[PDB]
Amino acid sequence: LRHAIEAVPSLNNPQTFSEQKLDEALYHGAVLRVRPKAMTVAVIIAGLLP
């Protein structure tokens, strides 16, 4: 999420009342990159269920 918010959106906030592109950065890191977290959780639970 931090890499996401770091790449693009460090330019629009200096202009006050700018939150539209701040949410797109969270979308880019929080839900586009959701395969790694799901994979980690799945393997963690699967290596313990037995």
> Quick check: 47 and 30 in contact, CB under 8 A?
no
| Closest by Cα among 23, 45, 43, 47 to 35 | 43
Resolution in A: 2.8
Query: What stretches of 1-50 show up as alpha helix (H) in DSSP?
Result: 2-7, 20-26, 35-46
Residue 5: CA count within 13 A, CB half-sphere? 9
> How far is Cα 42 from Cα 44, in angstroms, rounded to an integer?
5
3-9 long-range contacts, Cβ below 8 Å, gap at least 24?
Answer: 3/29, 4/28, 4/29, 4/30, 4/33, 5/29
**Residues in contact with 26: Cβ distance below 8 Å, sequence separation at least 6, in sequence order:** 1, 4, 5
